[PDB]
Write a structure and sequence with these properties.
The structure is a homotetramer. With about 280 residues, chain A is of the alpha+beta class. Chain A has one domain: Double-stranded beta-helix, CATH 3.60.130.10. Helix content of chain A is about 20%, strand content about 25%. In chain A, the strands form 4 sheets. Chain A has a 7-stranded mixed beta sheet, covered by helices on one side. Chain A has a 3-stranded antiparallel beta sheet with strand order 12-6-14. Chain A is globular. Chains A and B meet through strand 7 and helix 5 of A and strand 7 and helix 5 of B. The structure holds cobalt (II) ion (6 copies) and sodium ion (6 copies). Chains C, D: It comes from Streptomyces sp. Tu6071. Chains C, D: One of its GO terms (molecular function) is metal ion binding.
Chain lengths: ~280, ~280, ~280, ~280
């Protein structure tokens, strides 16, 4: 992918780049197309100095990527159901995740601007799931190619589960990426639960190795745009100040990979799952 | 403790002994007192060849130890609410546990006879919690002496939790024993959940080392009597035949140890527990 | 005539009614059958078994080891003396898998020891393999592992299939063990650690093992090709065994489906889990 | 005059408006204060810093290492040349803790390298200790640990408190690190493994670390007494740094509250977690 129009400053070899010399407010078609190519190359891009970006322009920009979420309940900007308000007080959780993978159609990506927050504190990290897959040895890539996993959530107000390939192809690059994440993946469907725990434990740690991640410090006016299909992210929980972001969410992913090479694991009647590793029975 | 009356065949150095030359049916006071001393020395004792032991004698024997459970719902022998029927079909679960530690007053012990089952298969193992504590190095014994743990269960029909010392004294021997177990212990109260997971993971494995356990193969007419205050046990899940036992449960333990040396750990508002080790979100 | 008493459904059986001293070819054929069925068998009441008969018995199975340095019975280089003092190690292992030709099996008799303490456990490696789900069995069928040992006076390593096919039964068995397996050759070391850690624990589940309490005159015979065993370290009394070791195994499995993992120059192995750098 | 830009709330700050070449005693006092506050500081725009000034700067902190074998700048034995080719290792460590007197700290400038790739991370060992719950802090205060290294041309070990008191701030900091700590001396090895495994992961939580992208002319200065650091291994281009190392630390903590764990004769350490027996 050719991207030569702007001044691009990559964060790490794995992913991330800050793009200078762009004004989002009245971006042209040609400049948008270039930002989209930079997103496909760098997975998350950062656009500094966009203070004052109008609501209408933010929505138009998001709609250049696809349909925008109009969340039923999460607060939105007055007059604009597509611009979601994220407040550290109103709702943090530092855990590696890919957004909404407990649903059959997770988002394609998001546009986030932190409009209020501390000068230091509250960094966001992203990880490169292409590299997480590619860094596995050949026998393990071949195994994962034929597996699926159940992703689920069960909290007050939301119960959802979905089955996805463990390895998905990015529809627009054709490259394969890992598609499990600590927050929302439950278990691999074709393994028993204990085998699944062991393999997922390894994959979660490996996939978020420092060599596969980047860490971004938010500044006034900074916009992050990321591809949810091939990344995880993590919100660092190291601040107590009020922190507010404006977020637009682009819907419409269908994670797709190889046909599974085995049936789901079927337990016998009465079989009990005894995890090999301790988790407490009571949270906080 | 002096025990010289019968022929005693210890199973292992850690615990367990088979007692020959005893007839439970009309046991004398003096012979019972000797069996009780052998229980305090060996933690679990096995009495072979007791086929035909009458219901009235089984209940009288149990009552020599204390008050007998008359479970509200678990099935009991016709005419005898104290003799519980345990059926592999009607209700197994192979997990190390101490009985009912999710309650404030777990049982003192049990008398179990397997009246129907396979010739091989379905062994029971017991562990010595005195040795599990004593085998910890001095800095760790000193730490555990001042901790407590929450034990809990949440299944259809039963929700219960209780806080117990991590190290308890046996009231009748004065010796200290570990009092956590994989099945029912949730978390150590004075640690955060992640620290608790790490320490409990170590203790669970260490406490069930082969050097601290014994394994008993059931035969027709065999009776096992064990002290629930200072043991764990584990039912091996390696058979498919029907397996039936008659069980009498002696109530009335209060696990007691040192006063805790620290307050309970208090999380901050909104704090989320993220286990360091994967467990699946969906059981079977 | 033999009465067979299985210890567990997974493995192990005590065989009564046998006299090893002058066993006939036909009775030996039955013991052989029972060893292929039960993997380890225990023969009680053999006090006095002569040295010449013990050696002839082992030779029915194959060539006997004449260890250069282990003490042996005066006059009989094939009958090894195993003394808890002179030599224990409580660790799950399969014997000598760091060698290209491990033993087929062993015949052991604990002639001195405490009345309780010092049990030996065995595990069923057929069940350890069969209990894995289909995707994982498929993976392991195509893998090999390096087994090694590095102690004063012994350096050895060997590569073996992770899943071997027993030559007589045709049944597949796991062939890794905690004591001597180093790493799976086709994975990187960190992936290897994670998988082996799971397999070691799973393979010694109580549902796959048995535990034997030694009695005077009892002989244990086991197939080292499809078992692990573990010597429980819960005694301090003197414990002596007489052992004959049958050589000649060549673990055989599928051709690997992938090449060895090749690190890049200067690559460092950083284990994900801590081990101390200093032993005792 | 200095503008301070913290990287994270845990640690790290970039200091603009500084000229190291002829820094005054009073301005140095301010840098020293900022190092005790931020643990690692980054000074951009120092291209051309003279060798004599670089050495004088390090000498303000203490005695400089003159390594016998590491290459150094022609004419200047104190200015070490660190080349990605000639010498990386991505592993969390505190420098030379296998020695009884580790460095107080270092001054590093990456003079050649890629525009992206090769970040360095640091962690705050004060926060790693303070984030433990009270029972565990109480335990660690009374423990010590053996740190060691065994490579061709270097064997060293040292015993240090698990929790050290920084000499200037009086604040307590964890003093174990994954690369060089072997085991806690007062526990058995298996207990030690379990606790160190927890501490290593906890101590390098994202909430306790920072990540720095090197730029031409940037100098990093850090306090090795209360940090770990990690060199990210995500590049293949040539990377050269100039480093001055300040010697003279003696980690100090509470007298241990227990004796060393003493194994019995013949006791074997069997780790609960697998590590391969062969590296690369
Ligand atoms: Co609305
Ligand atoms: Co998110
Ligand atoms: Co009734
Ligand atoms: Co029970
Ligand atoms: Co052996
Ligand atoms: Co260093
Ligand atoms: Na649209
Ligand atoms: Na597991
Ligand atoms: Na699709
Ligand atoms: Na009574
Ligand atoms: Na933990
Ligand atoms: Na009491």
């Amino acid at each position: 992918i050719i991207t030569t129009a702007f001044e691009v400053r990559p964060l790490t070899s794995a992913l991330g780049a800050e793009i200078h010399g762009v004004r989002l407010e009245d971006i042209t078609d040609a400049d948008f197309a270039e930002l989209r190519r930079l997103l496909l190359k760098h997975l998350v891009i950062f656009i500094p100095d966009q203070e004052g970006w109008s609501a209408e322009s933010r929505i138009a920009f998001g709609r250049r990527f696809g349909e925008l979420e109009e969340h039923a309940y999460l607060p939105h900007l007055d007059g604009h159901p597509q611009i979601q308000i994220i407040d550290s007080e109103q709702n943090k959780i530092p855990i590696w995740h890919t957004d909404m993978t407990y649903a059959p159609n997770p988002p394609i990506g998001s546009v986030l601007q932190i409009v209020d927050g501390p000068a230091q504190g509250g960094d966001t990290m992203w990880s490169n799931q292409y590299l997480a897959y590619e860094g596995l040895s050949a026998p393990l890539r071949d195994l994962l190619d034929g597996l699926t996993a159940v992703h689920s959530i069960h909290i007050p107000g939301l119960d959802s589960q979905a089955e996805h390939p463990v390895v998905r192809v990015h529809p627009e690059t054709g490259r394969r990426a890992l598609f499990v994440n600590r927050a929302h993946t439950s278990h691999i469907a074709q393994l028993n639960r204990n085998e699944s725990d062991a393999l997922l434990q390894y994959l979660y740690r490996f996939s978020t190795s420092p060599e596969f991640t980047c860490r971004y410090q938010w500044r006034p006016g900074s916009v992050a745009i990321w591809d949810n299909r091939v990344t995880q992210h993590y919100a660092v929980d190291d601040y107590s100040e009020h922190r507010r972001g404006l977020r637009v969410v682009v819907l419409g992913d269908t994670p797709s990979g190889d046909k599974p090479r085995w049936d789901h694991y079927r337990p016998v009647p009465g079989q009990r799952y005894v995890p090999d590793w301790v988790n407490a029975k009571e949270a906080y």
